[PDB]
């Protein structure tokens, strides 16, 4: 069978086994927290240029395209994450704009692979634009040729606020979600104020949010989990007693906390009927739910319906003991972070992002500056260089005489030599001079941004406010003590 | 009314006859086959690349024109692959085409073909405005009504017409014999029919036969009417047991072996010579082994004359020998094919000369502007520095020297690489070369015999490239 | 598909041209093995085409014809089939019958819509 005798290669293959199973499935990353397959989806959708501006497209074709541009990995988790980042209700924020059959929230994952027709959302335009942006190393695949980026850089801790699902690999962890607006607020307060305290930002930060809209009670678990990320908290559904025209009372729920089925709990209600461990209950009904979710339990008189609500949030799954585990990974090794340290690593990432983008733009401007330096030096002593080309013979003689007379490089000399008559009007000569000084002003501006670091902070805050303007984030949940 | 009905009769009869009856004198190439070769040249894919297996070619053909069947277009393809019927050669192909056997190759697109070697030089000079064009009914692409030629294929491949008024037999001939006939009529406008007997000893076949007559050939090349003998080859050899064995290789043309053999079996089996149960007619993939053995107490020659009376081993092959030119049919003789091909090639060469003068004098005008630019430069530079517009620069150049608009703008098309003096001498050298070639073409245009010499040049080109002998062994 | 019923709207949906035939060609012609009709050859003169349509049936006598504007005009007006079979079989078993006694067998020239016919002098002229 095995007959493998060398324990050393067993240990080495076992370390690669463990770390590769880590790297494969979902991890608390530095910059996106995502699966690498998510990164694959995003980078393929970007570099194919499939915008939401353009119309819809059959997406299983795109799935096979990305699968063929990448490794021959299995289709299952691919199509799974394809659905998951198109599910509007599960992830708090919108990524993939599907068009087909999914199942709403009640245990029917419709998997119509033929009908896989979709687009994306407009938030990847805020997520990543690294076309020219020297940011991230690449790994090569098909006989080691074609790029794949290591990480997903951004200007945005959105995926902090999204939430994570990486549990069964080694030890368990997740990321519970918040909303974005007060996140922007507390972040900018740390930006302009690098020496703030936790609880004063808890004054800025409400509870961990949920897309359905949850009733939150208690803050001791909030105190523990904003610090150390461990603990379960209690969650209740928006549930009311309503009187009829007859005086009969009605238990009316609006939503539920996270990871709840209507139908499994409904079967559990029918159990509780036939289990004969709860009384009073008459009608278990649910209709018209697509204009708005409306599930109604209706109970006879002389029953103490609020005590029955107490019995619901004691024994039924309507009560939620929602636990946290945010056990981080920063450059491979597992860690654990406070809410400050997350944003700190975000800050220094934005530092490196804007610095490297500015240096790429710097080298753009420097190269074009040397171009226009050569142009203006050609404009200096024109007829002498006319005599030069009327005299000399070769590339070597021309470059030697131009370097002796004007101290320029070879490419500069040849770009001089590539000047035609139709770029010899004094109009375009002074337009060269004008755009030359324009780029000089841009170089000086970027050097001034290199002088002081806080301009980066200010521009980040500006475009955070732009995103919060285009993406107003009202609340949906409710916190109590 | 009835005059308009007569107009419809005349015009529609012209449509049908020019459609599917005899082609022009100028090409000898039927317009179906003409468009086959034109679209296969406009495939562009060389015969050097391996020849294709597709009906996409014929789909573009049917997009070019709607017939009463593209299966007939494929029939035209296959009948131009019939080397055993139509001579050398118009198809570079691979697929099933059979022989003169009764073969049915239903695999239509599954055959391979592309351009052929003779077609390559046969249809050059499209890029020289030599031949006129007409638009299709589809109003999108054009087509030529005639073709340029490098030989009278009229004589190379014959004609087997249909009787719309009457059909037409035209026999094939030989390559180099036709070349010698061209040279003969070129050197002498005073040739005779015996001269034609010299440079053409006789019409030949891709298979071979025997033509015993002489004056039928004489009336064929003079009157255009007459019938000949087509005879099978006969070889009388000795069986080891004493039988006058008959070996046959050649045959009359358009004569399958199969039904002839069946009628021979019938004539045996109708109370006649029945002891000839010896018909060894096989192994014909090396050649033709059509061997019988005459029975004992019977001579071979009587059975030979009886099968000549069966009109299949000796056949009166007639000739109608008609043609189409200037919208009319015509009874044929030589100095008509001959002078027609001569003056057609005159048209082609002279119009090619005119087009080459067009290109050469245009480029000469360019290099005029180039050398006049390279005379004096820096003053033009400094006056350009006193300007800000290419229209102003054009007006400045018109004030400076005599140029064209194209010349002025091409002088504007000068980077700093253009500012040397060696390339001045190079442009001057090619300028004098081009002036010398223009004067050469003008002197050739003031030379009638030089055209004939160019015709001799192309004849010697195709003669060094190819030749063919008389495979059809003819005794008279 | 789409045709238009009888009121001047010839629907010509060439894309929608989806069809079958009727079961009467099984009575019309079965010449597979049947040495009946010469053939003419087309694409470089190879493939068959029959000269005529033989049958066992004068059905197309009873159908009707439309050949008018070519030279002079002619048609074939239709009958029905049953009394046609009757009068034909009477001529078969009786080769020396008269016209009007078969007009006793043959009603007027028929029409598919169902027409009111008056008069028989034109019937006398046109059957002759």
Numbering used by the authors:
A (entry chain B): 6 to 486
B (entry chain A): 11 to 486
C (entry chain D): 105 to 232
What sentences appear in the manuscript?
DNA gyrases are type IIA topoisomerases found in bacteria, archaea, and some eukaryotes (plants [Evans-Roberts et al., 2016] and plasmodial parasites [Dar et al., 2007]) and are capable of relaxing positive supercoils and introducing negative supercoils into DNA as well as performing other topological manipulations.
The C1 map displayed C2 symmetry and further sub-classification imposing C2 symmetry separated particles with either low DNA occupancy or showing 2 pieces of half-length DNA from particles with fully occupied DNA. The 30,637 particles from the class showing good DNA density were used for final refinement with C2 symmetry that went to 6.35 Å resolution. At this resolution, the DNA was easily built as the density showed major and minor grooves, and even bumps for the phosphates in the backbone. The DNA in the Dihedral complex is well defined and forms a B-DNA double helix that threads through the openings in the four dimers forming the complex. In State A the DNA interacts with arginines and lysines in the WHD and C-gate domains, while in State B, DNA interacts with WHD and tower domains. Modeling of a G-segment on the open complex shows that the T-segment DNA in State A aligns with the G-segment DNA with an approximately 82° angle and the DNA in State B forms an approximately 64° angle with the G-segment DNA.
